[PDB]
Amino acid sequence: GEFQRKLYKELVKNYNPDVIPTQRDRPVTVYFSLSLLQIMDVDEKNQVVDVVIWLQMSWTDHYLQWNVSEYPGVKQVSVPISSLWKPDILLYNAIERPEVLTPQLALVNSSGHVQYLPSIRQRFSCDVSGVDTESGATCKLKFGSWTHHSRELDLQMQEADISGYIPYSRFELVGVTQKRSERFYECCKEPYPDVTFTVTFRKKG
Amino acid sequence: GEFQRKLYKELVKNYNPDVIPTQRDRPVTVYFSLSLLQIMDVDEKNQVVDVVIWLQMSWTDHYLQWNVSEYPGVKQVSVPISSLWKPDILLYNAIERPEVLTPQLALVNSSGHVQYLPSIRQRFSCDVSGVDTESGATCKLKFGSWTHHSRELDLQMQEADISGYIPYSRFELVGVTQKRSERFYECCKEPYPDVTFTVTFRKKG
Amino acid sequence: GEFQRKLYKELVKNYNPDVIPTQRDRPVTVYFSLSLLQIMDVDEKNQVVDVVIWLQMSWTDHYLQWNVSEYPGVKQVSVPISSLWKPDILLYNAIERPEVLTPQLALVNSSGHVQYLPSIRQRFSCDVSGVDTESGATCKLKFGSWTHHSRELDLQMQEADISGYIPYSRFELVGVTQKRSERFYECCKEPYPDVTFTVTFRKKG
Amino acid sequence: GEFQRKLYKELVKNYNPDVIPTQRDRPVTVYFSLSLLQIMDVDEKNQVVDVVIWLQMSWTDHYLQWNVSEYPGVKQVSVPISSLWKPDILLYNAIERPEVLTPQLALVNSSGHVQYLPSIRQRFSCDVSGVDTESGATCKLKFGSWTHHSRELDLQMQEADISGYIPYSRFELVGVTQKRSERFYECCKEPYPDVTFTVTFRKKG
Amino acid sequence: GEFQRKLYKELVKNYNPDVIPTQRDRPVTVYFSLSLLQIMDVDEKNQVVDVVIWLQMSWTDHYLQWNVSEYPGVKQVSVPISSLWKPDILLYNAIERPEVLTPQLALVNSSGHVQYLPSIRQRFSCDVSGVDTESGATCKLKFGSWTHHSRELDLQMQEADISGYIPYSRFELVGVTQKRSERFYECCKEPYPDVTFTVTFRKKG
Ligand SMILES: *[C@@H]1O[C@H](CO)[C@@H](O[C@@H]2O[C@H](CO)[C@@H](O[C@@H]3O[C@H](CO[C@H]4O[C@H](CO)[C@@H](O)[C@H](O)[C@@H]4O)[C@@H](O)[C@H](O[C@H]4O[C@H](CO)[C@@H](O)[C@H](O)[C@@H]4O)[C@@H]3O)[C@H](O)[C@H]2NC(C)=O)[C@H](O)[C@H]1NC(C)=O
Ligand SMILES: *[C@@H]1O[C@H](CO)[C@@H](O[C@@H]2O[C@H](CO)[C@@H](O[C@@H]3O[C@H](CO)[C@@H](O)[C@H](O)[C@@H]3O)[C@H](O)[C@H]2NC(C)=O)[C@H](O)[C@H]1NC(C)=O
Ligand SMILES: *[C@@H]1O[C@H](CO)[C@@H](O[C@@H]2O[C@H](CO)[C@@H](O[C@@H]3O[C@H](CO)[C@@H](O)[C@H](O)[C@@H]3O)[C@H](O)[C@H]2NC(C)=O)[C@H](O)[C@H]1NC(C)=O
Ligand SMILES: *[C@@H]1O[C@H](CO)[C@@H](O[C@@H]2O[C@H](CO)[C@@H](O)[C@H](O)[C@H]2NC(C)=O)[C@H](O)[C@H]1NC(C)=O
Ligand SMILES: *[C@@H]1O[C@H](CO)[C@@H](O[C@@H]2O[C@H](CO)[C@@H](O)[C@H](O)[C@H]2NC(C)=O)[C@H](O)[C@H]1NC(C)=O
Ligand SMILES: O=C(Nc1ccc(Br)cn1)[C@@H]1CCCNC1
């Protein structure tokens, strides 16, 4: 791509990926969603769950926009996430770092809309004593920004599915639910939005 | 030697390896193939398979071509893959990152034809309940680009091998098959090509 | 952030993050505290404890201050800890490196006050023979600077918590305590401050 | 000291360590040899062997030569292998990456002769069903260049050792042998040299 | 603070940390010593020992000296070891890389005297068949430079400790000893100094 190469040359000018791309008094809105793909194992003694999940993040970076008439054919581009601002979201339940299974790339369109969809292997903390009963075991997965409050980063959920769930795993799903919440912590005087996914599962036999 | 060093100096000028090397409305065609070398282990409880496979990728980068009369004796060069555009292909079944066994190098000829043949240790998801029966257990390995559609990256399969398979492993092969598929998904208005390899194997005793 | 981007450009000028930001004959005061989140496992044979703990560090870097009238709306900024001076604190009991669960980011306000709150998975050495008794097993966690004495880095403790402790872990807490200590060795004429947190716990069965 | 520092400044000028240092129609000859230090474990079920081996590589880089009269006292220098051209040799039997135990440094003399002697922990594939018999189990270790043919990189073996072998390991050696081989495939018109070491060992009980 | 920042700016000028800081025909003398902190585990089948040890290295770098009258108050500085020349010492018995537990920092005074005291978790090879007897099991730990001979790097031992040994480990110490040696080998025409520490220990039950 000749035009793509000219575009990347224009896009890098003055762009600093350590700065959140806010504007006037508008936050950056980040749409967040999840697909549970597989439950791999449960550690009943240490109260741990091992999963593969597919995170889905979307936002708008007003510094990454261009005139599509000026760069013809260049509808959307594939950029390594390392060279963009990325929201600093994390799973509060985790007891190990995430292992990232997908390429570390994001899609960007001409509006400056960004899409980043990492698939991750993750172990996390949960009371799983009921996993071998009819009613099963329920676990929470709280996600949110580490350093940014509502007025800087507006976290917003989108609807999940379980169409990706694996049929041949020895755990079946009894229920899922999701909820956006906004809260105060003692630390900080502003409010912090989180998105929490709840999964009830159990052993098949 | 001397000429190769002058060549690398000319090739780096203006080359950006984060940009796919397309032109007008010609995709980059990537020829993709595979050799299964060994099945290392199977986890019957967690439904996982552990393998060593030898991936074979070939494409053409019109920015990596040179006049062989200007660089005499320089027929082909050995370049670290880190300094080229590389196709963003992945195994959709994987539940861990790949462990790469080979040097991270590619061969490039004077036309700009590129060749990259990584050998990989990889664990992936498969229903292997039938692995201890006469008919055995069948597993799929779906490969494809993470961000690029047909009009940008034309995935094309080539005929695969089991001539390298290991005789002393405790699993025998009952059959293999391979299939290219092209599909439309709700997400995107363009089509996405994948290449899928299917292996049926079973335990010897 | 337009102003944030201008600010980072001014803050990097002459900043060297390998130099401790002392001034005249004032040390850098570092306020240090902790929250115990979970006891994951105990190795009775090897005398090891596995935990998740949330460290809380605060200090002031007089090179990171700015006039808020010059950078309007810029109250506080989110910076990667890699590009600041960071205190060289460690856990003297540790027998493995720390696994850092949180994003490696710190908050900085317009005074130059810095805040860094890593959450960590850590294995460490402790006599845990009494863990299966009524009175239980007591373990110490000694923290302090590796290279800096009191006149350069003034370590100060703050009151630690167990409000985050996990209810479903198979260990219950019998008590906690904390103590700052300042000490001389024959070697060196200056004193060295440490902060030590003590936890008594036991097995629920 | 002073002269070594001046020498490194002159040696880096125009040196590109991604280019093989060939000349006219002379390959780079690489002398390759090995010492088996210890057999650590054998996995009879998965057909794997775990070893520590000491590789010994020597070659000549005509770009790394200097006049010893101009740099007096500077007979040989210790350089990090990362800043030289290194041959792209690998073990074809390996099923995991190598764990390098030694410092990543090479010795260079005033002729431009280079010496690099990494010691490595390595797991590899071998039929070890006979390991518990009188005649024992034989395993091959095939080494060679990944991208370079005979006219570019002349692989040459040298006589190997077992004088370093550990007496207290539970495996004894019944024999070793070594062989250089040169081979054609239909694909490619140039020949490819490998060096293979064969070890027969058995369990002492 | 201000003066330290000016000093680091002057010290980096012309400093190349890949070059050993020798002078005329004076080697760099490196004083080396050790404290055994804990024996963590023993593998009786594979003949391996797991330890934590505290290495103590001191030398003089005549390029890192400054006039204390010119940089008032600047008695000593804390520098990351990555930006200095460091001696290339290793443990010849090791079968895994070292896990470094301490911050990677060294102390430097105005004379150019350097101090670097890494604490390390390390597994190594030893005959430990006698570990369950009255007389116990003896193991050697040979340290020395990988690339430097006596005329460049003069290794010198200093008297070691067991005052830091852990009382609650299930191994007790029966004795320690230490010895500096200098040798010629066929390889090399110059002599090579090593420092070896011997530890006899046994199981308490
Ligand atoms: C960046 O973020 C930091 C992090 O806290 C802020 O720093 C604090 O700022 C506050 C607000 O100005 C300071 O508050 C003052 O603290 C002083 C503390 O010192 C005394 O008290 C304790 C004893 O318990 C000891 O630390 C010390 O030895 C002293 O004895 C007080 O002197 C002040 O009290 C006075 O002010 C109040 C107003 O709040 C008056 O109403 C009272 O009458 C009284 O006169 C006050 O409490 C605090 O010092 C700072 N803390 C730290 C840790 O630095 C920065 O302010 C913030 N950036 C910006 C721009 O605000
Ligand atoms: C860059 O990508 C973004 C994300 O796909 C595009 O934004 C989307 O734009 C469309 C039309 O502008 C929006 O569709 C409308 O949605 C509402 C309901 O949500 C509905 O009432 C309308 O009838 C219509 O369906 C869509 O909401 C919007 N989504 C987001 C998250 O912004 C954008 O158009 C792309 N840019 C270019 C130049 O193609
Ligand atoms: C730089 O280092 C290299 C190390 O290899 C030196 O090269 C080799 O030096 C040896 C010295 O023994 C030469 O050996 C010769 O080999 C025959 C063996 O049949 C022997 O009979 C001769 O008497 C002689 O010793 C060898 O020629 C040479 N390497 C090769 C590939 O031929 C080199 O000398 C060093 N240079 C300097 C200036 O230090
Ligand atoms: C660069 O490599 C390409 C691909 O290997 C070469 O093109 C092939 O050459 C063979 C000759 O045996 C043809 O039959 C194939 O059809 C070609 N393949 C493709 C995919 O085009 C080409 O010859 C090489 N370049 C040079 C200058 O020799
Ligand atoms: C820099 O540090 C070295 C390391 O200790 C100091 O040298 C030692 O100082 C004592 C006390 O005078 C002597 O008895 C030792 O023999 C010295 N040398 C060594 C190699 O241990 C040195 O004095 C310090 N320099 C300054 C200017 O403070
Ligand atoms: O022990 C305290 N804090 C503390 C100490 C260690 C740990 Br772990 C957790 N919390 C006291 C508790 C009562 C109030 N003052 C601090």
What would you say this structure looks like, in words?
The structure is a homopentamer of 205-residue chains. Chain A has 205 residues and is mostly beta strands. Chain A has one domain (1-205): Neurotransmitter-gated ion-channel ligand-binding domain (Acetylcholine Binding Protein, Chain: A, Distorted Sandwich). Helix content of chain A is 5%, strand content 46%. Chain A contains 1 helix and 12 strands; from the N terminus they run αββββββββββββ. In chain A, the strands form 2 sheets. In chain A, strands 1, 2, 3, 5, 6, 7, 8 and 10 form an 8-stranded mixed beta sheet that branches. Chain A has a 4-stranded antiparallel beta sheet with strand order 4-9-12-11, with no helix packed on it. In chain A, a hairpin with an 8-residue loop joins strand 11 (171-183) and strand 12 (192-203). The longest helix of chain A has 11 residues, at 2-12. Chain A is globular. The termini of chain A are far apart. Chains B and D meet through helix 1, strand 1, strand 3 and strand 5 of B and loops of D. Residues 109-111, 113 of chain E line the site of a molecule of 2 linked components (NAG-NAG).
Shape of chain A: globular
Helical percentage of chain A: under 10%
Q: What percentage of amino acids of chain A are in beta strands?
A: over 45%
State the domain count of chain A.
1
Quick overview of this protein structure:
The structure is a homopentamer of 205-residue chains. Chain A is mostly beta strands. The first copy, chain A, has one helix spanning 2-12, and strands at residues 28-43, 48-60, 76-80, 89-91, 99-100, 105-109, 113-116, 119-125, 137-145, 153-157, 171-183, 192-203.
